[PDB]
Amino acid sequence: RGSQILCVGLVVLDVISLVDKYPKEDSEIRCLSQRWQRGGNASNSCTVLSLLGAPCAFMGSMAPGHVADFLVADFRRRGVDVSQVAWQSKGDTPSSCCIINNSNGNRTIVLHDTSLPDVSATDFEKVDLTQFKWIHIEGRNASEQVKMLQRIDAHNTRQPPEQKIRVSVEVEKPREELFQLFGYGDVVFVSKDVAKHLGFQSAEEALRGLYGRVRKGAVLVCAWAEEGADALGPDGKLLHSDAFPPPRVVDTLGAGDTFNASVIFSLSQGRSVQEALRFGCQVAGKKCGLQGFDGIV
Amino acid sequence: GLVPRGSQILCVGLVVLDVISLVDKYPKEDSEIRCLSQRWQRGGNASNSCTVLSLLGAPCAFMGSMAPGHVADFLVADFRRRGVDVSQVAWQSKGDTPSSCCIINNSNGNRTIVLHDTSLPDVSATDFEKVDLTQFKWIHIEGRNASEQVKMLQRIDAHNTRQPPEQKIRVSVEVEKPREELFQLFGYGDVVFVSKDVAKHLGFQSAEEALRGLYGRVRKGAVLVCAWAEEGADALGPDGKLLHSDAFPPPRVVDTLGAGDTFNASVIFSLSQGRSVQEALRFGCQVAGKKCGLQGFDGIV
Numbered sequence: 001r002g003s004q005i006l007c008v009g010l011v012v013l014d015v016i017s018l019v020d021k022y023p024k025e026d027s028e029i030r031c032l033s034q035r036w037q038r039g040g041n042a043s044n045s046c047t048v049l050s051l052l053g054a055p056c057a058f059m060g061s062m063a064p065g066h067v068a069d070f071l072v073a074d075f076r077r078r079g080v081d082v083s084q085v086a087w088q089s090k091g092d093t094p095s096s097c098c099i100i101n102n103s104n105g106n107r108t109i110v111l112h113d114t115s116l117p118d119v120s121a122t123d124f125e126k127v128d129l130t131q132f133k134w135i136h137i138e139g140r141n142a143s144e145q146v147k148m149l150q151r152i153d154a155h156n157t158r159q160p161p162e163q164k165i166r167v168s169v170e171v172e173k174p175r176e177e178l179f180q181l182f183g184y185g186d187v188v189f190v191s192k193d194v195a196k197h198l199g200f201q202s203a204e205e206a207l208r209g210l211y212g213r214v215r216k217g218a219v220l221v222c223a224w225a226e227e228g229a230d231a232l233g234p235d236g237k238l239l240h241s242d243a244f245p246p247p248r249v250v251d252t253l254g255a256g257d258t259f260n261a262s263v264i265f266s267l268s269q270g271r272s273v274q275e276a277l278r279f280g281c282q283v284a285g286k287k288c289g290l291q292g293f294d295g296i297v
Numbered sequence: 298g299l300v301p302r303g304s305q306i307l308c309v310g311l312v313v314l315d316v317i318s319l320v321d322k323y324p325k326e327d328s329e330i331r332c333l334s335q336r337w338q339r340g341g342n343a344s345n346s347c348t349v350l351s352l353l354g355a356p357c358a359f360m361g362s363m364a365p366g367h368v369a370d371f372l373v374a375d376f377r378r379r380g381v382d383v384s385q386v387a388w389q390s391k392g393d394t395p396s397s398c399c400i401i402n403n404s405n406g407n408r409t410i411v412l413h414d415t416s417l418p419d420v421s422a423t424d425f426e427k428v429d430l431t432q433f434k435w436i437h438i439e440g441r442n443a444s445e446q447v448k449m450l451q452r453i454d455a456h457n458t459r460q461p462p463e464q465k466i467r468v469s470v471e472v473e474k475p476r477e478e479l480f481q482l483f484g485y486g487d488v489v490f491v492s493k494d495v496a497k498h499l500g501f502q503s504a505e506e507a508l509r510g511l512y513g514r515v516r517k518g519a520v521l522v523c524a525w526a527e528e529g530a531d532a533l534g535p536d537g538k539l540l541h542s543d544a545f546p547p548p549r550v551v552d553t554l555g556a557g558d559t560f561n562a563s564v565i566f567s568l569s570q571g572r573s574v575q576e577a578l579r580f581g582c583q584v585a586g587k588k589c590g591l592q593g594f595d596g597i598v
């Protein structure tokens with residue numbers, strides 16, 4: 001069957017305040033405007049995949065309430081298949097305050113991480129893999145997710161190399177539990193932040209450094225903000241793309257997630273890595289000159 | 298439902314959703330962090346006063362602007378959680394329901410605040426024209442859009458004219474922000490609360506200075522009231538006698554957000570039960586002092 005891309009990670013309620021300068025501690029400013037957004041990484045990518053025309057599904061934990069009710073209404077307005085959601089009985093829907101600096105698009109996030117339990121190999125074991133051509137996993141609970149990945153590798157072995165499910169991993173946080181995911185998946189996304197918190201000061205360094213850790217045959221991608229992004233495949237040849245900066249950067253909240261969704265969409269449509277990188281930077285760049293996600297397509 | 302004539306106390310003003318985050322350290326711009334804890338709270342001066350009026354046992358209503366949406370839903374259910382009648386809300390078709398973001402540093406205590414946008418339209422005098430006043434024994438107004446609020450106050454004067462002294466609606470006004478627009482509001486109301494912040498911005502350095510210095514601006518026969526945190530609160534009436542009450546410090550101070558509103562509501566309450574101004578200053582101070590030792594409004598009983 002396999003027409004859908006699945007993203008596994010967080011859905012968070014983003015309570016957003018657009019200010020024109022980042023307030024100095026102990027001071028007080030008035031925001032230009034405010035809004036609510038369905039956020040969290042896997043969730044954001046689903047938004048982006050949807051907008052690009054790719055049928056997709058989200059999978060993460062949500063706790064029933066008025067909050068979950070809004071997040072789902074939004075998922076459904078987008079056409080994001082939520083049927084894979086691991087509903088919880090104990091815990092709250094995470095949320096966060098996001099101050100977005102309108103003069104330069106900087107975004108500052110205060111996350112309220114609830115009790116809410118992550119999805120587990122248990123919940124995942126319960127999933128119909130034959131619906132998906134691509135599966136992307138937001139690194140969080142490594143122990144449990146590695147399990148999930150193996151269930152997919154093991155599912156690929158019993159498949160025509162034609163009908164194999166493509167797998168991508170994001171390692172966005174500098175915490176060590178996650179460095180095992182490097183690891184699995186055809187495509188591995190590592191953030192500038194991780195890369196720096198590990199000694200590296202350029203996208204090309206990070207890639208020469210970390211290529212050691214990836215499933216043989218994998219592509220490692222590392223974006224570097226206004227500097228574009230680089231990728232490195234089995235052949236050893238470094239690939240680069242210049243960023244596409246909008247003329248006014250006004251909102252970079254979910255720029256990384258836009259990059260990733262875009263890279264995945266492109267690879268999932270047959271494109272070269274070079275083309276998918278370029279496209280990643282192109283949509284990310286365009287989103288930086290917009291409030292939210294509407295208007296990138 | 299049916300509200301018995303002359304039974305409710307109405308507070309007009311702001312309701313806002315405050316999202317309050319406690320953090321290890323103040324986050325550097327463009328960073329992502331995890332707060333120690335986060336809380337969603339209904340706030341705003343007329344808003345907090347209602348909560349307290351309800352907890353004190355007074356039927357009370359809130360009048361302010363909201364826009365349909367999920368923030369309004371949370372604020373409305375919070376009002377209801379506190380027994381506040383929201384049937385007088387002025388629902389708006391344009392703008393955001395006010396939402397403030399508030400960041401508290403756990404390792405030095407400072408508060409950083411992103412204030413709600415200014416997009417939602419205040420309640421106008423023409424909205425106020427539409428309200429049947431007979432349900433109210435007292436109307437309290439948090440000064441915001443004074444040009445318009447003056448009209449509302451003039452309407453209440455009109456109404457009181459055709460009424461026996463025992464169906465006249467008492468009126469209180471609150472000037473809490475140092476803005477020229479607001480000062481005309483001194484001229485209206487039987488009771489006028491001026492905040493410590495306003496008094497200082499005008500150069501006064503105590504409750505006594507402020508009361509002595511501003512009483513000139515209130516209408517004949519009005520009482521002017523100035524609370525001053527740990528120094529207690531003063532009041533000055535037509536008879537020229539300055540009245541005072543000391544503060545009642547709690548065993549330990551925990552949460553002073555909304556203490557000014559707790560005081561306001563408590564004085565209003567006491568006056569409305571027929572108590573003397575002196576008895577009501579005291580009570581205002583007792584209640585606001587108890588509230589200072591408590592998280593939120595819960596245990597103020």
Ligand SMILES: Cc1ccccc1Nc1nc(N2CCNCC2)nc2c(NCC3CC3)ncnc12
Pocket residue numbers: 223224225226227228229243244245246249252255256257259280281284285288327
């Ligand atoms: C290419 C990419 C990958 C992953 C995340 C974001 C991006 N793109 C950009 N991120 C940021 N970031 C996110 C990281 N913090 C800084 C802003 N800034 C820009 C930018 N800024 C305008 C430059 C001043 C000319 N122009 C184009 N693309 C991006």
Ligand SMILES: Cc1ccccc1Nc1nc(N2CCNCC2)nc2c(NCC3CC3)ncnc12
Pocket residue numbers: 524525526527529530544545546547550553556557558560581582585586589
């Ligand atoms: C009486 C009153 C009217 C209006 C607003 C507040 C109050 N009461 C108090 N405010 C503050 N404020 C609120 C404003 N920031 C400073 C503390 N501190 C205290 C306090 N502290 C105990 C220490 C012995 C003095 N004890 C009793 N009442 C109040």
